[PDB]
């Protein structure tokens, strides 16, 4: 049996206030608490009678009505909460009409448990547990404070902040910690945030868990600095203990919700080690007048507190000494001028116990203006889920679908001022989605803690990244070659032929195809011998022009030296054009070229051959040129038959990705057998040279002709493979047939030359 | 509804020595201090002794004091008073009182009363 604070009236309503601390883990079973609590238990006790003996002088808020309470100690436990709410409803095995508290999610589900079967009415002003709001199970609960999703909300926007991915995770066994810790995880899990791991922890657990948990802590230290706790107060003191005792200090980050926000119990003696965090908070004004009826009470003067005379020497530690609570264990009396007003710290959460005993009243008024000796419960109900009226900091109190009030939070941070001295900041908030939290308080300095990563980026650049599979967080860099580009951020492609990535590495642009072959001097040296050999051919065509007399010339047909000179023109143009262009008329002419002139040079020296090969018979001495022409037009017929072969093209060819080139068409087999008809001609010519070597010439043209032959057959020997040559196979046959036209030239008239002169 | 009973009275010679028994029903008992009364037929009302709440405070009057002494049981919820060296000018009714929201002693105001028992010393 333990006491009970009552006060008389025609309506009783319950409360159950966490005066004393909740039972060690060693004594559990025999139910017996702890120590005295001050901004909880009796400044809750205190609000409460105040705020009854305030209601009921109003002549407005239920007149002619007095309200009664019954103001029962909860010390923080489920059972002795269950036992001391079994006391409610003994009366019902004057009745208990409605229940302001617990201030617990555990403990307010038991009560609720239990009280629902007997239709009581209970509205709780700190339980923001998220599974309390089902009315299906819970139906006769209402808060005047949010749930705790959008705190789970708020924490993932601050860490979503000042990017953290790699947070560590704290919660603390019981219905609150657990709701609160898989939202803020199913939040935090469609993003990058990958908490490293899990923990929970009992709040009366002993020191040898709290050590255990900081070595398991610890052990993510490097990368995971932060540690995202939604744990109560005695859990976050426990943390900051074990801090103490293993030497640490400073190598943590700790996000904090309500539970610790804004109290100096917990960061009491351990200031140093609790440095840095930040914590978020319920908005909540301070009210006055409940600082004014405070600050005055005394001990010998408070006949309604049953708490009071403890409490009073607990905070003074001194021993009244003729009061009837009077205790010895203190050594030193209390003094007649010890106040109240020395180190005042008002609880932050007064105001929403004061609006849910306005609440009650509320409702209770709003049904009596509708008898109503047995009060009805679910009547109560139904007037208590519309009520609707202005609390005590000017805002309007008004319950939802689900029986909850909206609200807003601040964001605290605690840090140290001075010397010696430490404090909470209030450094932004969070209100309806949106979050305005400044950066210049936390963190003034470039001095931003490292944040909770464990991997360095990898990007502008062929590097990849590759997930292991532990953690879609943590990776390892690759990187890709010199002809890949970044598909995805996990993935390089490689491109076809003739395309290089770009700098960016985000795609390949096909680099243009590269030629420039006026600009190199080879061919350059090819255009100047070129031109010089179509010079001399024109000076000795014009010189032959001028002399068509010919006096001596005559020995050797007009005819001939002008198909000759015509010849060797074609040569040079085809030297000349063999660069030209990669157009598609340009290589027809080039081969057209190509097949021409060689061939009528040789047909044409053949048939000077053999007119003096019959003279030691003849058909038609005279008329025997003609035929030779027409021995040119079989080679054109052979050309006909390249045409048949493959018609002429020009195509990209790739000697490797780096370089692309772009060469008209040529067969392979296709130049062979031009060559073949040509060489099989300078063979004849050569043996009919051969035949007739030594005759005797008028002016020694024997000589020079059998010269002529075999110095073109050696060049064509040599030239043969040099076609196999090469890979690029472009220059080689332009000095080939620019040198056996010049060779030609030379040993053909020279001695005209000699003899002209 | 604590209640209180007392026992032990009767008549003695002077000189010698006796116990008062002041026995509570119903819990809650070690949360009252108590307190001894005495009334001798027409006088007024005295104080005589008290113990807190949790025993081990002990105040006397001084008329009486170093020959009373007030104890406390909490298991069987009883309170003793015993009486030592008593005279003549001792004989007369006591009482049995629990205190709950008091001053230093004896500014204390009871809740509850009990009977009383006559106590008389004869020469």
């Known amino acids: 049996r333990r006491v009970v604070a009552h006060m008389p009236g025609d309506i009783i309503i319950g409360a159950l206030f966490s005066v004393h601390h909740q039972p060690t883990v060693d004594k559990v079973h025999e139910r017996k608490c702890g120590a005295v609590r001050e901004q909880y238990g009796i400044q809750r006790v205190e609000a409460m009678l105040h705020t009854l003996e305030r209601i009921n002088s109003d002549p407005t808020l239920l007149p002619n009505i007095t309200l009664g309470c019954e103001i029962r100690d909860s010390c923080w436990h489920s059972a002795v909460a269950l036992e001391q709410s079994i006391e409610f409803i003994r009366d019902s095995l004057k009745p208990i009409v409605g229940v302001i508290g617990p201030g617990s999610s555990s403990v307010a589900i038991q009560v609720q448990n239990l009280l629902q079967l007997f239709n009581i009415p209970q509205i709780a002003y700190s339980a923001t547990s998220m599974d309390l709001s089902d009315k299906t199970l819970f139906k006769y609960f209402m808060r005047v404070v949010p749930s705790d999703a959008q705190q789970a909300r708020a924490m993932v926007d601050i860490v979503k902040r000042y990017n953290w991915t790699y947070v560590s995770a704290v919660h603390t066994e019981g219905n609150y910690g657990e709701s609160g810790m898989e939202a803020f995880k199913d939040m935090s899990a469609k993003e990058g945030i990958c908490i490293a791991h899990s923990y929970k922890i009992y709040s009366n657990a002993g020191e040898q868990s709290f050590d255990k948990l900081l070595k398991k802590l610890t052990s993510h230290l490097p990368k995971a600095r932060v540690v995202a706790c939604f744990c109560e107060g005695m859990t976050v003191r426990g943390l900051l203990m074990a801090m103490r005792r293993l030497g640490l200090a400073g190598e943590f980050l700790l996000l904090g919700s309500d539970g610790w926000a804004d109290r100096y119990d917990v960061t009491d003696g351990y200031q140093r080690e609790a440095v840095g965090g930040i914590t978020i908070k319920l908005q909540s004004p301070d009210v006055k007048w409940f600082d004014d009826y405070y600050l005055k009470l005394r001990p010998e003067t408070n006949h309604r507190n049953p708490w009071f005379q403890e409490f009073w020497q607990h905070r003074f530690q001194c021993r009244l000494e003729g009061f009837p609570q009077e205790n010895s264990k203190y050594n030193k009396t209390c003094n007649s001028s010890l106040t109240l007003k020395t180190h005042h710290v008002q609880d932050s959460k007064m105001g929403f116990v004061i609006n849910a005993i306005y609440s009650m009243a509320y409702g209770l008024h709003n049904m009596q203006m509708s008898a109503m000796k047995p009060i009805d419960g679910r009547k109560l109900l139904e007037s208590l889920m519309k009520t609707n009226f202005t609390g005590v900091s000017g805002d309007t109190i008004l319950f939802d679908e689900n029986g909850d009030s909206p609200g807003r939070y601040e964001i605290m941070n605690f840090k140290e001022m001075g010397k010696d001295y430490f404090d909470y900041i209030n450094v932004g908030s969070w209100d309806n989605g949106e979050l305005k939290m400044d950066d210049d308080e936390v963190w003034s300095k470039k001095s931003n803690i490292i944040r909770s990563v464990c991997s360095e980026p990898c990007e502008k650049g062929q590097i990849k990244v590759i997930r292991k599979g532990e953690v879609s967080c943590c990776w390892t860099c690759t990187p890709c070659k010199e002809n890949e580009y970044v598909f995805d951020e996990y993935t390089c492609k490689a491109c076809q032929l003739g395309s290089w990535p770009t700098d960016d590495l985000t795609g390949c642009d096909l680099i243009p195809v590269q030629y420039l072959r006026w600009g190199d001097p080879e061919p350059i040296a090819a255009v100047v011998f070129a031109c010089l050999g179509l010079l001399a051919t024109l000076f000795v065509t014009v010189v032959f022009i001028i002399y068509r007399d010919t006096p001596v010339v005559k020995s050797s047909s007009r005819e001939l030296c002008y198909i000759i000179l015509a010849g060797i023109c074609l040569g040079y143009l085809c030297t000349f054009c063999l660069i030209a262009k990669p157009k598609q008329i340009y290589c027809y002419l080039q081969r057209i070229g190509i097949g021409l002139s060689p061939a009528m040079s040789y047909s044409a020296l053949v048939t000077k051959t053999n007119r003096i090969a019959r003279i030691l018979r003849f058909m038609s001495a005279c008329a025997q040129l003609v035929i030779a022409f027409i021995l040119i037009c079989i080679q054109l017929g052979i050309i006909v038959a390249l045409f048949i072969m493959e018609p002429p093209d020009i195509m990209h060819d790739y000697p490797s990705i780096r370089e692309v080139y772009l060469i008209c068409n040529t067969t392979n087999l296709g130049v062979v057998t031009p060559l073949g008809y040509n060489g099989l001609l300078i063979l004849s010519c050569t043996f009919y040279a051969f035949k007739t070597r030594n005759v005797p010439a008028n002016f020694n043209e024997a000589k020079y002709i059998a010269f002529t032959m075999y110095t073109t057959c050696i060049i064509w020997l040599a030239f043969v493979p040099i076609y196999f040559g090469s890979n690029y196979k472009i220059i080689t046959m332009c000095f080939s047939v620019s040198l056996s036209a010049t060779v030609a030239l030379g040993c053909m008239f020279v001695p005209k030359v000699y003899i002209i002169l | 509804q604590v209640q209180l009973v007392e026992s032990g009275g009767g008549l003695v010679q002077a000189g010698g020595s006796l116990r008062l028994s002041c026995a509570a029903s119903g819990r809650t008992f070690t949360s009252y201090a108590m307190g001894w009364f005495r009334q001798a037929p027409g006088k007024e009302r005295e104080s005589v002794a008290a113990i807190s709440s949790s025993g081990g405070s002990t105040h006397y009057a001084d008329s009486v004091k170093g020959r009373f002494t007030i104890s406390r049981d909490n298991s069987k919820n009883t309170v003793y008073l015993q009486m030592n060296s008593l005279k003549p000018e001792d004989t007369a009714v006591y009482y049995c009182?629990?205190?709950?929201?008091?001053?230093?002693?004896?500014?204390?105001?009871?809740?509850?009363w009990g009977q009383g028992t006559q106590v008389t010393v004869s020469s």
């Open positions: 009182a629990a205190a709950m929201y008091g001053s230093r002693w004896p500014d204390w105001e009871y809740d509850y």
